[PDB]
Amino acid sequence: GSEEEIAKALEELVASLAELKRATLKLLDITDKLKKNPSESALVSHNKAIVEHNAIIVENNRIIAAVLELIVRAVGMTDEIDLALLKLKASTARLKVATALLRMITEELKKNPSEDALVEHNRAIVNHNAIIVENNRIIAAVLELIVRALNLTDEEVRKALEELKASTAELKRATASLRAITEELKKNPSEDALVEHNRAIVEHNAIIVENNRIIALVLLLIVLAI
Amino acid sequence: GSEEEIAKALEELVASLAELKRATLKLLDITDKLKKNPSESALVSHNKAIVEHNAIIVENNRIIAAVLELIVRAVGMTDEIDLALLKLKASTARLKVATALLRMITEELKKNPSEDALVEHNRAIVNHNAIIVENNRIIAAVLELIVRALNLTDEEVRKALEELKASTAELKRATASLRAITEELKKNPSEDALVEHNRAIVEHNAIIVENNRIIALVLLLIVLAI
Amino acid sequence: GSEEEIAKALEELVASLAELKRATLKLLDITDKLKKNPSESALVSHNKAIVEHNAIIVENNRIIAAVLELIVRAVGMTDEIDLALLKLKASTARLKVATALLRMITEELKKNPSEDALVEHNRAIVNHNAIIVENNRIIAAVLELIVRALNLTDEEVRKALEELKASTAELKRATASLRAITEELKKNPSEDALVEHNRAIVEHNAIIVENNRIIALVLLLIVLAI
Amino acid sequence: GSEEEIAKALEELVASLAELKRATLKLLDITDKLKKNPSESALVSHNKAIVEHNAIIVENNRIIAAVLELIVRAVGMTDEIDLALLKLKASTARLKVATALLRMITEELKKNPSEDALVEHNRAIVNHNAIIVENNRIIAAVLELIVRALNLTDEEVRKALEELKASTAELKRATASLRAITEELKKNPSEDALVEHNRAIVEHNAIIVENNRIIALVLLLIVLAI
Amino acid sequence: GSEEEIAKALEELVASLAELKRATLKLLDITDKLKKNPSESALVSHNKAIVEHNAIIVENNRIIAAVLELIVRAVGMTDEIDLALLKLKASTARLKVATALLRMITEELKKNPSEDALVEHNRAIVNHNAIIVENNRIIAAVLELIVRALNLTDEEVRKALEELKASTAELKRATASLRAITEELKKNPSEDALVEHNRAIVEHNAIIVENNRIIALVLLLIVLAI
Amino acid sequence: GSEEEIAKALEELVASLAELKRATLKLLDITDKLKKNPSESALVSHNKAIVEHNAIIVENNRIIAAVLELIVRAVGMTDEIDLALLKLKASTARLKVATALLRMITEELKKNPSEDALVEHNRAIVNHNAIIVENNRIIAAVLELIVRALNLTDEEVRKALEELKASTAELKRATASLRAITEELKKNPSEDALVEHNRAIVEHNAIIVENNRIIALVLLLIVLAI
Amino acid sequence: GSEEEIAKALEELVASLAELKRATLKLLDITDKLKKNPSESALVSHNKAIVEHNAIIVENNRIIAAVLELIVRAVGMTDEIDLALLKLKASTARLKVATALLRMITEELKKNPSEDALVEHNRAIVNHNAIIVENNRIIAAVLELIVRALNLTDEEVRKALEELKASTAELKRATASLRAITEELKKNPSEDALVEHNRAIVEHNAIIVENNRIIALVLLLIVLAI
Amino acid sequence: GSEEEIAKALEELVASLAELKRATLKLLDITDKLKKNPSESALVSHNKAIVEHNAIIVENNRIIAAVLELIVRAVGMTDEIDLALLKLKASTARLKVATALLRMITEELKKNPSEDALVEHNRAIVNHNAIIVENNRIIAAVLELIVRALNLTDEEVRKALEELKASTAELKRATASLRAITEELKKNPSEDALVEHNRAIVEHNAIIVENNRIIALVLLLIVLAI
């Protein structure tokens, strides 16, 4: 597309980030304290603020992938970029099936709510998060490819990639740790461990959002450098 | 909606109740005594204070239904609550056609005013009242559902429901009695029976307002308990 | 459509009637007396208040036909109802061409205003009225069909149809009388006969509005009975 | 097509006429007076309001021909009607090439603007007008054929044809006069004669629009009589 | 097809399930209570909400079979899978003739409505339900084949099959019970038994929809595992 | 807002405090002694001077929260301040529903006045006080945040916070003690305990007003330090 | 657009200038003197009045470009004007990405505020200023093109262009000087140099506003001359 | 609009005239004598009482044009009236750009005040006056058209038009004389000629206000004659 289409898509992107950061802060805050004990309606909506947060992350990743396509179709594909973009499309398609699965098990929780089903639902949320991390690792690979293809040596871009790589490794380590503790919850299913597992989820979602922030930065520094 | 939207809608609700209670008392007072006999212009406006009262009750029920939707869309729907809310929307739509019919026959009384048309107009007012009672019985069913879904066991709520159920049965009995006497008026149409039928209407409107008062109470006790 | 769509369309209908009755009364009042003699600009706008009234009647008939379609598509078509609805659509299409013709001859009166063209314009208004009467006779046939199909035996509906039939025959007789006097105007074209023919038009428009009032009543009694 | 399709196409037709009459009046008004002398940009847009007017006439004629096809395909073709419709299609195709030629020479005037090229452009506008007159003479022949085929003897139609024939002869005489003066401009090319030739164009466009008005009238009187 | 085609088809599938569950709930709700007795138009539309529900189930099964074909054409056919897919195509073709038969007998009920024809129509609905159960038993066989072919041993899939088999046996037992009671209705045709047979239909449709839910689940767990 | 808007809002605040301190002193004085025994009209207005005092406290808290928003929207939000301000808005919204509930139970006391309903009304006043204490604990948290964010180290501010914290802990202890004695009144309902419970209410209101005095001080010392 | 649309857009333009001149004067005044040393909250909002000023300049340039499009679409495009307008659209799109980048780095300063990040933020403000200067140089080129195309020889316009060109060269020289000193700050990062670099920014913003003033003047003199 | 809207707009008109006549008299009086010599602040506000007077004339003309539109939209447009009203709208739009230009050059006089800029500002005031005269000549043409269209032959109206025409020619002659002397000032710029040119401006403003008086009279005589 032309410059105005990319600029409109980047305004949609930065407004989506400004919405996702507020929702992240409020989800940590409602994760912080509550003395009182939950209702039956608090089973029917067990984790609704997390599934609603993940949906915003998935919508942010879809826009990032649409901007990457609009950029590359401007600067011109090469073999390796086209292979990486096709991988990115296959991963974005996988994310739709993973979302429709989480959105099914969440509604099936309206009908067999029980302390065991709550652990199944939490494991479904961990598997959705583990697939969002893959989508981000592919988008970051496509971006490093586009930056090398343009021979784009500005120090702002260099430093923004040096930050993006470290944020990607931080997100890998956090995902492996979340799956490790989720196995321990699978061994020892309890309300006591469920309460402290919900925090581990919210603290992994925080790292996802702190990675999408850098992906949007590198996208801006590229569109300004071209 | 957020807490401020429900709080604003409940301020609109309680101010509407404080207006409707004054109008109820004044409508009984102007029902109590008048020696002098009516004019021709007192045919053209035969019952205007009753139709003006019913319009306020219909406007109060619309606000109650908007608060119920804002609450349930916060605490989260379930199959039976969502079915009951859809019933409540269908009944609130029925109430609009019943109001527009009463507001047509009232204006048709400007053009064929006669001692027979006055009995038709009174029967239209009784059928409007009989449809407002249905709208209240659906709102009370939705409220008892929401209270059970929240597992809301406070004694203030328990006692407020124990009052709401008895007021609903009192209103059913009063509606059946008003239609029963309205059949006797349909048999024996006279000014003598018209005068004593108007009181039966005003004494049924009093029970409607004494029911909306308890519906607004239970709505407050719920919003304070969440 | 669902109950809320029909209820919104009936609120649009009754508000359109309350606008059309006021415009009818004011058009009779401005038909009643004026001593002073008209200008040249009173040729360029010879009957503008009548053509503006007819446009409101045509817009009211369009809404009535949209409600009839929304009702029948809820309760279910049968062979004879579907044939009658297709007739109603063909007549509502004819009414659009008749309106665009009256709205052309009215503007052609801005450019050859003369005492002869005024008689052409009055005959165009009579032919528009004669086509609105047909549209009402088809809508009334569709309504009597729907009432028989629902086996809807309430006395309120029976009496409202007994009124609708008499108003339809009154409107047939008034249309034949208006066309009869319009032939006499065609023989004896004069300002003197133009003045007394304008009243005959306004007294036929009054019967059209007194028929739409009953069509809207029967529509309400049906939607309340289902 | 069915009655509703013709009625929609006639609403498009009459709205197109109401737009074309306003554009005609404003084009005469901007033809009336201007003291000040034109710029170089007033060469680059030498006659833009005429070419923009002709485009509206061509779009009105396309809709008239689409209504004629929808009518005849309803009432049934005959040998002479089908021959005349095929002639009308060949002339409407010729009009597209004549328009694309005027729309080419107008843009070639952006690149060799000179006092000689302005006279070429004016002659191209006269040749476009001379081809629109042919399209109108074929549409008027098709209409007189359809009216005779229906044996449609109403006096409104008879008088509307008696007007259409005279307007067609008036348009023939005006086209021959415009071509005659255009030859005199071709002999004596000057700004002085260009100014008075532009008026002759605007006064021929006025007769075209005053002919399409009658073609649309006869189309309405036909669709109302069938 | 590619990953994006299956992902689009699974979004269509899960949205179709979310529409079919709402229609199931509303069909039970309109099965729950109604005091008043039906009209003649309530013969002309005797079971319309059931035939409209079955049409949605048939449209959901068509999409499930299209996803199964898109999956198997990706992972690769084998003899037994290709035989089972050809069986599935033959059953999906049979379902089209069974639907067109129900859609014929329903319209023949517009023309000989009688208490005997209502029992014929109910038996046609039972035979349609009995053929949808077969289509589900073939789709479930194809799915168990595909799962074994992929050697797909995840516990989420294992448990989802352990649920699918039990739901298939529950649906067989419910179909045999519905046919058994349909024989008793065939012996004792009455409005009294018709009312309680309609409930047996709605309670069998509920089990069909509770089976399609599990077929769509297993389809998601497969597409995520491949 | 600009300096003049904050200065006007602080003049409104200090004038509201000067009204609330006088009303507190007079409410203690009318709590001190009265020999004579109350009327029936002294049931209909059982505690009116307390509910009228609480309404003034609620209006002072509303102004404090509007000044806090005007200050922070000048000096610039940060994550933790914006979260705390949103908590403050949710609590100020909760206070409106708690007020409308107290203002309902007070008017319901006009209609079933009895020695039992008086204990219900006193418990409603205690629950309103328990919600005002929460609103103050949120405002005091927001103020300590703003003071740390400005790095505002003046000794006047430090000492004013050292007073505000101690007053907040004094108010927590007084609220827990008031609820404890209110439970004992709920066990032992008597005029004898009602008389000594009214004093406990007035002595808790005194601590609320002695806390708003310090909140208004810290607000002034902040607006003067920036 | 018509004359009223351009006149409305020029009223929006001149009101935007009257807001931007006041903000320029006040930003110099708050740049002039302050003895006291900044807080931690004075890091979180380090330059907020500059970024808020730049946003107003960007909004003024958007309106100027909308007026240029409305003017040229009235007087008629030519090759060079249409190329220059497409350049102006591409530069206005670039300005949106540059703004969203400045609005990101400013918010990232809420989370890693440090003496090094403040120098990054100051360099981001210098790069935003360097892109606004480009947008102004393109708008001034479009205006000189439109003035030559209209052959607009008035002495007010001639002198207004002679001022616009000199102001554009003054703004080029000031931008090169600001980038030169920004390199020296990049070498020698200190609070001491940050304080004197902030003045260089405010003294470049003053020249931008003193250029937008002349662009709006030439736009008025053009719209009055056509 | 209805009679009350026109009557309110004519009350606004006559109150605006009563304010403008007082301001005219006082502006002549402060133009009459002052011995003492002006300050530097008497450069920064060189002609402020004239520009403030012109703003009142422009606001009076806006109301006159709004009343003309409300009148004609009541009595009904014709081709020539509609063309003249569209001209009046284009001229009223031109007057806004001419005002915003005068209001820019007046403020630019705060920043380069010098004996040469004062002559520029006086020439800007003369060009604004020359555009108000055009707006008045269009309003007077529209009024003479409306009077002929109503065939309004009263002698009060005839004589009021006979006055309006002479006042319009007097205002044309005065404008040509003011521009003639303004050319002589442009040749011979001096304080001596500036002092005597300011009087020529004030003596032209007097004729504008003495023309608006007659336009408001004719507007009243028309609204009273219909």
Residue numbers in the entry:
A (entry chain R), B (entry chain O), C (entry chain Q), D (entry chain S), E (entry chain T), F (entry chain M), ...: 1 to 226
What is the paper's account of this structure, in its own sentences?
We then applied the filament design method described in Shen et al. to dock these connected monomers into a wide variety of helical filament arrangements and design the amino acid residues at the newly formed interfaces to drive assembly.
Two substitutions (V29D and L82D) knocked out the D1 interface (Fig. 2c (left) and Supplementary Fig. 3) and the other three substitutions (E32D, E33K and E87K) favoured the originally designed interface (Fig. 2c (right)). The resulting overall architecture can be viewed as a right-handed helix composed of two identical, parallel strands with contacting subunits. DpHF18, DpHF19 and DpHF19_9his disassembled at pH 3.5, 3 and 4.2, respectively, and all reformed when the pH was raised from 3 back to 8.
